[PDB]
Amino acid sequence: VSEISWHPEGPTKVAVSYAIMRFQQMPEKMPTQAYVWDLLNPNSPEIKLMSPSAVTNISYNQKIPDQIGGGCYNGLLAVWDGRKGENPIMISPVENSHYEPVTHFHWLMSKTGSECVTTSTDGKVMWWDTRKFEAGPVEKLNIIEGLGENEEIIGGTALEYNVEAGPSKFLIGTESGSILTANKKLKKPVEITTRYGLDQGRHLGPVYSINRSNQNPKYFLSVGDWSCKIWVEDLKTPIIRTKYHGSYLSDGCWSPTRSGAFFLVRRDGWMDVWDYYYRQNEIAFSHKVSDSPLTCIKINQTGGAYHNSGKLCAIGDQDGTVTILELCDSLYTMQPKEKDIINEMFEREYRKEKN
Amino acid sequence: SAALLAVGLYDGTVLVYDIRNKHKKPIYQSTVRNQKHTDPVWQVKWNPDTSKNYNFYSISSDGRVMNWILMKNKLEPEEVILLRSTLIGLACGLCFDFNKFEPHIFLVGTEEGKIHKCSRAYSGQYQETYNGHLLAVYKVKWNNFHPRTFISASADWTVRIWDSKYTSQIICFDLSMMVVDAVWAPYSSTVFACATMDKVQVYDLNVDKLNKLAEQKIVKQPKLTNLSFNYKDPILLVGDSHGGVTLVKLSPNLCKSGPEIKQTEDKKAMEEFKNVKIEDYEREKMENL
Amino acid sequence: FNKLEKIELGGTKGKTLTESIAQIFKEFEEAVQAFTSVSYDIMNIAEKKFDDDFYEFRSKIKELERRLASVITQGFDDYDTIYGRFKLLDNFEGLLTRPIIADELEKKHIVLLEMYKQDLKQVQSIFLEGKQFVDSMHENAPLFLNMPPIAGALTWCKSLRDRIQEPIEKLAQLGQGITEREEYKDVQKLYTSITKSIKDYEDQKILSWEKEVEDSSQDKLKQTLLCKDENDLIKVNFDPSLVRLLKEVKYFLLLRLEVPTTAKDIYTKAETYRTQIVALDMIVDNYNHIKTCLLEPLVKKKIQDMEEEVKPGIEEIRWKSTNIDQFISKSKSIV
């Protein structure tokens, strides 16, 4: 389960992709197809998404209800319709679309007719237009590290984008362990402003997931190698490093409801939760999901019917199983003076790193 | 919140109960993973401050003053001080008390016999030591309406009144039978009660310098394990060895602002003239010695 | 003490510690305000009043230095990470009060050495378990996402080697003869045995790789074009081991360490192959879906002519010398 995404209206359906990220280990003519589950009938998938090549990353588009877009292992981008499904309506050209597999695909909500962004291990970030796939993508940025004369092209392993951050900033993680920021301009076609962890913050492995809290968008975490870290929207070095772990971390995300707590998933098999409201030293609680590794986590943004926001956590296993965990009514619900305390703590840590 | 009930028992397990709860199981427990002290927990007290959740204080015979903080389905322990010379191990501790005027300064009694004054600030240091007693001090308690003054009741059949500034005692009270515990009166300063081998004995420093005001035998058959004072009314509680707990209402002959009844009309006097009279009495003993 | 105010450690349990530091700073501010009064004094040797004022101030400082030592011990019992604790020290590195803090640091130094042993031992246990899986090339391996099975090991080994090496460069900076302490010496002896065992595993992987690099360079030259099945369905014959070699070379340059001999020539042109393979493909496909489209007994000559036109090339195909640009296009004008 290479990537998961939730339905934007509410927690009714969960679109999930399927591909092998192990190199050449994928069989000859393996079944290349993403599915979409409903929480009413979890026996078999509600609808099938037939693709040209195995789909690496998919996501729902909040702008157009049920329009799933996905990045293939080939380098191709695809877009389906969640109602009819079957075959993909928009497919990129083979030659101009980047080499090596789409490591992240996210929608640019802040636009009339939706647009989509896409990074790769080729190390070329791209801003695609969904209405107009035409002759390749609009914007081409290669991820150079250091500037000066030394220019090495390093694979864009994770991409983060938020409404509160705005259409200006695109927060990009790399293979080498650094994190770059690409501010798109109508002036100069693109600029790579900040370099988060050129020196100290450098992760020991690739930055597999970035995310920023919906409650406080200044503060974002990146889940590289063994140890998750937390950053601030100007500073170079990370504010809070959080331990090391049993095996590596594949993914991790903030609770959309609660600023304090954020959930990591380990390749050992365990999920582990860090609730910073109570304790900053130890884990809140750990939970075995599967003996097989965990390749992705996603959490429900917005609630409907019975399930409120931040309650259900869809987690993707290497076996190919996708578990949905109803969290405790304390963990998703806001505790008293939570948002105030975490703002004070982060402000204290921002003063720390200055000092 | 009077519902919160602090409990200490053998194997140095720390229990918390709520009277409100119907099921009547412990709300909280200490385990080996929560760094529970070994042997027993002789004394246990609540911290009045409620800024940092709910602070519960405990002492063990192992001799580690432990501060316990209430969290959601977990107990966080913090070593306050260690009791601690050409001996083996840590010194044993049979009682502790916190000064109500200064929350930093707190006294601790030892099986060694030497009472110690201690700060929450510095963990691995003593503010002062008192080499008065010869045997294990059962109960130390600060006096009401005055700082830097306290009683202790030891196995060595002597009840002694210190001032924190001085290193030795100001007064001692030799009784033939073993002293079991001494407790200050809450309504008036310079009034305490001492229980000894079926004999409860109340003193007043204004009324008599040495001699006992009242001596009584609540119950004939057993021995007296502990006594405690009520803050609202003049009523003493007295425990027996057979789990029996008899209460005793004191005489009105003892009181406060006694020299003249409703004289000067001082409201401040009830929490200051008490502070002044022990000082006036304290000076008298310094002239004697 | 002026530096102490500025310090904002921010670690673990918060405010309560900084509040305690603030009250400590206020007490100091009262003492220095009382010293500033300079009643008599004025460095007069004949006056024996300053000497008394020193003894009063020295006692206040000795009380203050004991409160600092207690605050440092609380703050150290909190972070619970060799990194977080080393960061705390650095804040008070200029705020060491000569021997009274140094007596506390001696005890603190022993605890750091014990913490680094546990991490170092834990890495060793992860390396031994991993080493088996890396060589095996099992599912759920230490190798992370799409890497080569060879370069992936070296990057994995590097990531471990880098984790262990960060505290040692920090430990060297500590004073008070940490190197002379027998406890430190036992950690260094352990470290050396782990680094050697990791380096030995890298040496086995590079040596085994260099042999595979020589075998792969042969395949490329004699690869040509292969067309399988009863139906003539010619395709790209490019070996998977040549694609993995092409990726392997790029990750070696990223980690720097060392590089292969005469595999540079394959990596420079590498880009040109990845345009030419796509470009080639273009035509290849079209041929397939051209072969199966017929029902042909009408217009044999055309189709034949494409077969007869293609029938060399494939023969032509040698990655030694690519003139694909043309071929391609002449086909393309006719396909």
Side-chain angles (χ1 to χ4, degrees), chain A, chain B residues 1-208 210-289, chain C residues 1-224 226-293 295 297-335:
Chain A
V1 179
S2 46
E3 193 72 357
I4 299 169
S5 86
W6 281 91
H7 182 63
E9 167 267 300
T12 55
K13 302 194 299 300
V14 171
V16 304
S17 74
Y18 290 107
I20 309 297
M21 302 312 305
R22 314 202 316 109
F23 174 46
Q24 306 192 319
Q25 305 297 321
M26 48 174 56
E28 296 172 35
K29 300 166 54 54
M30 60 129 60
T32 62
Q33 48 187 311
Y35 301 130
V36 175
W37 266 269
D38 207 312
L39 306 197
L40 197 151
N41 69 309
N43 262 337
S44 90
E46 190 192 346
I47 185 163
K48 190 193 299 301
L49 312 178
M50 197 83 182
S51 57
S53 176
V55 197
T56 315
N57 296 67
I58 66 176
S59 67
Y60 270 105
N61 190 29
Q62 52 261 301
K63 289 294 299 195
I64 309 306
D66 294 300
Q67 180 168 20
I68 302 159
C72 297
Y73 192 85
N74 287 191
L76 298 165
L77 283 192
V79 185
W80 309 268
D81 207 303
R83 298 284 162 77
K84 74 195 185 63
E86 293 172 4
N87 286 40
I89 47 167
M90 320 305 267
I91 325 171
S92 61
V94 177
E95 302 85 37
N96 216 313
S97 182
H98 55 191
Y99 332 109
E100 304 209 322
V102 170
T103 333
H104 195 100
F105 173 102
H106 202 71
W107 293 101
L108 285 63
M109 51 223 70
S110 59
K111 261 284 171 180
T112 55
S114 46
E115 309 189 316
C116 40
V117 59
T118 271
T119 62
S120 62
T121 306
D122 190 37
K124 276 203 178 172
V125 189
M126 280 141 175
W127 286 250
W128 300 84
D129 209 324
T130 316
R131 293 183 316 285
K132 310 166 199 176
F133 265 92
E134 58 195 333
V138 184
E139 193 65 42
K140 283 214 178 207
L141 159 61
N142 49 68
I143 310 176
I144 294 162
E145 198 72 33
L147 300 171
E149 202 278 312
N150 292 311
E151 49 180 31
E152 309 174 325
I153 308 182
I154 314 173
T157 317
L159 175 138
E160 182 57 27
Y161 175 90
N162 214 75
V163 176
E164 298 289 315
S168 45
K169 296 205 68 162
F170 281 74
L171 186 64
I172 297 153
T174 58
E175 281 276 312
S176 60
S178 58
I179 291 163
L180 301 196
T181 60
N183 275 45
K184 182 176 169 185
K185 287 187 169 62
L186 304 176
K187 298 307 196 177
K188 296 169 179 65
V190 121
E191 204 78 44
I192 314 94
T193 57
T194 320
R195 301 195 150 70
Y196 289 71
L198 205 294
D199 176 40
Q200 198 190 320
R202 279 289 281 281
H203 267 108
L204 308 182
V207 178
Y208 277 106
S209 278
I210 304 161
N211 190 5
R212 58 176 77 201
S213 39
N214 306 149
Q215 301 296 313
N216 273 55
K218 274 184 65 170
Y219 307 105
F220 82 80
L221 72 85
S222 112
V223 188
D225 59 62
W226 295 277
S227 58
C228 159
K229 302 186 190 170
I230 303 177
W231 268 278
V232 184
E233 208 58 42
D234 185 41
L235 188 76
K236 312 309 191 176
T237 67
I239 249 181
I240 290 156
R241 189 191 296 186
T242 167
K243 212 191 165 75
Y244 284 68
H245 288 280
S247 86
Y248 303 94
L249 304 170
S250 300
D251 199 313
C253 294
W254 303 88
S255 198
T257 54
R258 188 218 271 255
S259 328
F262 68 102
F263 309 81
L264 309 178
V265 293
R266 322 194 303 189
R267 206 169 295 166
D268 185 32
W270 294 69
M271 187 190 71
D272 48 292
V273 191
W274 288 91
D275 193 0
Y276 270 137
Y277 172 77
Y278 290 109
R279 306 184 72 177
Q280 170 161 4
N281 43 20
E282 291 193 338
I283 304 102
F285 94 104
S286 55
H287 185 250
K288 188 74 166 186
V289 176
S290 169
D291 288 14
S292 306
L294 275 47
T295 46
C296 190
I297 184 163
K298 216 71 166 185
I299 316 167
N300 71 305
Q301 301 167 11
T302 77
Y306 290 103
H307 297 125
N308 291 18
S309 311
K311 176 136 64 208
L312 308 189
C313 286
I315 308 179
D317 305 4
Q318 198 177 286
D319 180 29
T321 69
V322 181
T323 73
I324 301 189
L325 315 185
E326 189 176 38
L327 299 175
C328 207
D329 67 307
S330 58
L331 268 162
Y332 74 82
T333 309
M334 280 278 288
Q335 301 299 117
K337 311 180 185 179
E338 181 281 329
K339 185 180 174 184
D340 184 32
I341 279 175
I342 202 190
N343 285 21
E344 286 182 352
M345 187 159 62
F346 287 146
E347 278 169 26
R348 199 161 68 102
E349 295 279 26
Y350 187 81
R351 278 185 276 100
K352 140 98 324 298
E353 296 300 329
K354 282 182 92 290
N355 285 24
Chain B
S1 40
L4 280 171
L5 204 167
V7 173
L9 56 86
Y10 259 78
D11 311 315
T13 94
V14 151
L15 269 55
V16 179
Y17 286 96
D18 274 37
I19 308 160
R20 299 144 169 182
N21 292 53
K22 205 150 283 184
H23 62 102
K24 97 173 71 176
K25 300 188 295 186
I27 300 297
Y28 293 115
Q29 284 193 52
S30 61
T31 63
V32 179
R33 292 283 161 284
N34 312 25
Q35 310 302 319
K36 79 170 195 181
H37 28 224
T38 63
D39 308 10
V41 273
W42 288 105
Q43 188 68 39
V44 153
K45 276 200 178 190
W46 278 111
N47 191 229
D49 188 27
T50 62
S51 300
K52 45 184 156 186
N53 297 306
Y54 288 108
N55 273 26
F56 162 116
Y57 282 112
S58 184
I59 195 179
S60 55
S61 206
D62 179 42
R64 308 197 285 92
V65 177
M66 295 305 298
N67 183 22
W68 310 76
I69 322 176
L70 277 59
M71 301 293 187
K72 304 305 184 177
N73 201 46
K74 193 55 56 179
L75 256 67
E76 293 191 5
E78 297 186 8
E79 300 202 333
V80 177
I81 62 171
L82 288 71
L83 297 185
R84 200 81 68 180
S85 53
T86 62
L87 291 172
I88 176 65
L90 307 173
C92 326
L94 290 185
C95 176
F96 79 98
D97 204 309
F98 276 90
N99 182 216
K100 61 172 162 182
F101 292 93
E102 299 186 38
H104 294 281
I105 302 178
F106 84 92
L107 285 158
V108 66
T110 61
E111 190 257 44
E112 283 182 356
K114 300 180 166 59
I115 302 160
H116 284 274
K117 190 213 298 195
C118 316
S119 61
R120 295 163 69 181
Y122 12 120
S123 56
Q125 279 301 144
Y126 274 130
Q127 277 200 328
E128 200 165 315
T129 180
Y130 312 95
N131 305 2
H133 269 313
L134 187 48
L135 288 178
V137 173
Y138 282 140
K139 294 289 184 197
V140 171
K141 293 213 167 186
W142 297 97
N143 91 300
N144 299 38
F145 313 119
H146 189 252
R148 103 191 192 282
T149 294
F150 64 95
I151 301 288
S152 100
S154 77
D156 180 18
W157 40 64
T158 51
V159 187
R160 310 199 183 183
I161 327 198
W162 287 262
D163 177 284
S164 294
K165 189 191 69 57
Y166 296 93
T167 56
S168 70
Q169 95 289 14
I170 307 181
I171 315 183
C172 45
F173 285 86
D174 184 39
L175 327 179
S176 51
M177 301 299 188
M178 186 161 61
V179 166
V180 190
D181 57 327
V183 174
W184 279 112
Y187 58 90
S188 303
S189 79
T190 76
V191 185
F192 59 101
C194 314
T196 66
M197 210 292 291
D198 47 47
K199 221 73 169 182
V200 181
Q201 293 169 347
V202 183
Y203 299 77
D204 282 49
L205 304 177
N206 282 17
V207 178
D208 285 322
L210 193 285
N211 272 43
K212 296 183 282 288
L213 271 63
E215 63 203 323
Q216 269 296 343
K217 172 172 283 197
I218 42 109
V219 187
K220 189 175 286 186
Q221 297 168 35
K223 303 170 190 173
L224 278 52
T225 62
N226 206 74
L227 79 93
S228 68
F229 228 124
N230 189 0
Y231 54 80
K232 195 71 179 293
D233 309 336
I235 184 169
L236 262 173
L237 257 176
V238 186
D240 311 332
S241 69
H242 294 323
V245 180
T246 76
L247 51 75
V248 186
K249 88 184 303 310
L250 299 182
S251 167
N253 291 25
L254 56 85
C255 202
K256 54 184 180 293
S257 189
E260 291 183 299
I261 309 166
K262 300 180 178 183
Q263 198 75 42
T264 71
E265 305 177 21
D266 295 329
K267 300 176 188 181
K268 293 182 179 183
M270 311 326 294
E271 302 185 33
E272 292 186 33
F273 153 74
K274 297 295 95 172
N275 186 304
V276 167
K277 82 157 174 167
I278 193 163
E279 279 276 23
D280 288 14
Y281 186 55
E282 187 172 310
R283 289 162 196 174
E284 205 283 326
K285 285 100 67 176
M286 304 322 306
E287 292 194 44
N288 189 20
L289 309 180
Chain C
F1 305 131
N2 290 14
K3 301 177 181 181
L4 172 143
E5 159 224 52
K6 190 170 177 62
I7 300 178
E8 291 281 43
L9 287 177
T12 79
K13 66 171 168 163
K15 302 183 290 184
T16 54
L17 295 181
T18 70
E19 284 175 3
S20 193
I21 292 168
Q23 288 182 9
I24 285 172
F25 195 76
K26 289 173 184 183
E27 174 271 352
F28 152 60
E29 188 175 8
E30 293 164 359
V32 74
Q33 185 177 4
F35 176 90
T36 302
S37 71
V38 77
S39 57
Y40 297 94
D41 293 19
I42 312 173
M43 296 210 316
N44 289 335
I45 180 268
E47 298 186 352
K48 302 183 177 180
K49 298 185 179 181
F50 217 133
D51 189 26
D52 304 343
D53 300 355
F54 147 79
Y55 285 128
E56 294 152 31
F57 205 74
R58 191 73 176 182
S59 66
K60 294 161 199 175
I61 288 184
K62 283 181 186 183
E63 295 149 28
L64 191 46
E65 284 178 20
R66 280 296 184 189
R67 285 186 173 182
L68 296 214
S70 75
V71 168
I72 290 171
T73 50
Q74 288 166 51
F76 178 90
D77 286 20
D78 285 346
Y79 277 109
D80 297 334
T81 63
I82 52 169
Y83 300 97
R85 286 162 172 189
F86 188 90
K87 282 178 187 183
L88 184 157
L89 191 159
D90 289 12
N91 286 41
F92 294 73
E93 181 181 332
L95 191 52
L96 310 177
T97 193
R98 208 187 67 91
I100 288 203
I101 264 183
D103 291 0
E104 169 51 40
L105 289 175
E106 284 164 33
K107 298 178 183 182
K108 181 185 172 308
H109 284 314
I110 298 168
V111 176
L112 289 178
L113 292 176
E114 176 52 41
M115 285 284 292
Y116 178 44
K117 269 192 170 185
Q118 290 178 18
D119 274 32
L120 186 60
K121 281 170 190 181
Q122 186 174 354
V123 167
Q124 200 171 28
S125 74
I126 292 168
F127 173 82
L128 291 172
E129 289 174 37
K131 173 167 64 173
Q132 180 58 30
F133 285 120
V134 169
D135 205 335
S136 296
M137 198 196 302
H138 200 62
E139 298 203 336
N140 176 30
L143 282 74
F144 42 63
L145 212 87
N146 43 218
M147 276 175 155
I150 297 176
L154 294 176
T155 56
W156 170 61
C157 290
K158 178 184 165 179
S159 75
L160 290 171
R161 179 153 45 77
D162 285 16
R163 183 176 175 180
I164 300 171
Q165 193 161 17
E166 282 174 20
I168 276 188
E169 293 178 31
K170 292 175 184 201
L171 286 170
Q173 296 172 29
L174 277 329
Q176 307 179 346
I178 54 99
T179 55
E180 299 182 356
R181 307 173 92 89
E182 292 185 350
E183 298 302 326
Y184 171 97
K185 293 177 183 181
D186 300 353
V187 187
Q188 189 175 12
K189 286 174 193 185
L190 203 174
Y191 161 82
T192 47
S193 78
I194 286 178
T195 52
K196 282 181 188 183
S197 69
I198 291 168
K199 281 186 182 185
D200 289 5
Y201 190 71
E202 293 175 30
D203 291 338
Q204 288 172 39
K205 285 288 184 181
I206 187 194
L207 189 287
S208 60
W209 183 61
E210 285 167 6
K211 291 186 175 172
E212 291 177 27
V213 170
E214 293 175 21
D215 295 13
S216 54
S217 69
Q218 298 168 29
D219 295 337
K220 167 189 156 184
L221 297 172
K222 72 180 174 176
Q223 205 73 1
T224 75
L226 278 188
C227 55
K228 296 181 182 178
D229 301 8
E230 293 181 11
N231 296 7
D232 300 323
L233 307 173
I234 314 141
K235 195 56 182 173
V236 177
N237 187 207
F238 206 89
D239 197 300
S241 192
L242 282 168
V243 176
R244 88 190 189 78
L245 179 66
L246 221 64
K247 192 158 66 161
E248 277 168 298
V249 172
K250 97 166 175 175
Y251 276 85
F252 272 58
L253 291 174
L254 185 61
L255 56 90
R256 298 285 191 184
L257 262 56
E258 56 267 321
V259 297
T261 309
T262 78
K264 299 297 183 168
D265 189 45
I266 297 179
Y267 188 78
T268 54
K269 297 185 179 180
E271 207 308 294
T272 75
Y273 299 154
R274 300 198 77 187
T275 63
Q276 278 192 339
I277 280 179
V278 170
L280 177 56
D281 178 4
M282 290 195 296
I283 190 68
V284 162
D285 190 359
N286 219 320
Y287 166 70
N288 270 38
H289 178 98
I290 269 300
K291 219 299 195 169
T292 307
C293 79
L295 314 166
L298 204 172
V299 67
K300 179 162 192 184
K301 173 178 171 290
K302 289 286 184 181
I303 297 288
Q304 178 188 332
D305 274 38
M306 300 297 296
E307 294 183 35
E308 285 189 346
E309 282 288 321
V310 70
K311 254 174 205 185
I314 289 167
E315 288 182 2
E316 298 185 42
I317 304 189
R318 289 180 193 169
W319 291 103
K320 208 173 154 200
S321 61
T322 76
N323 203 339
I324 287 177
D325 188 29
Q326 196 176 169
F327 177 43
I328 259 181
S329 67
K330 286 295 178 189
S331 345
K332 181 172 301 307
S333 306
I334 199 65
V335 131

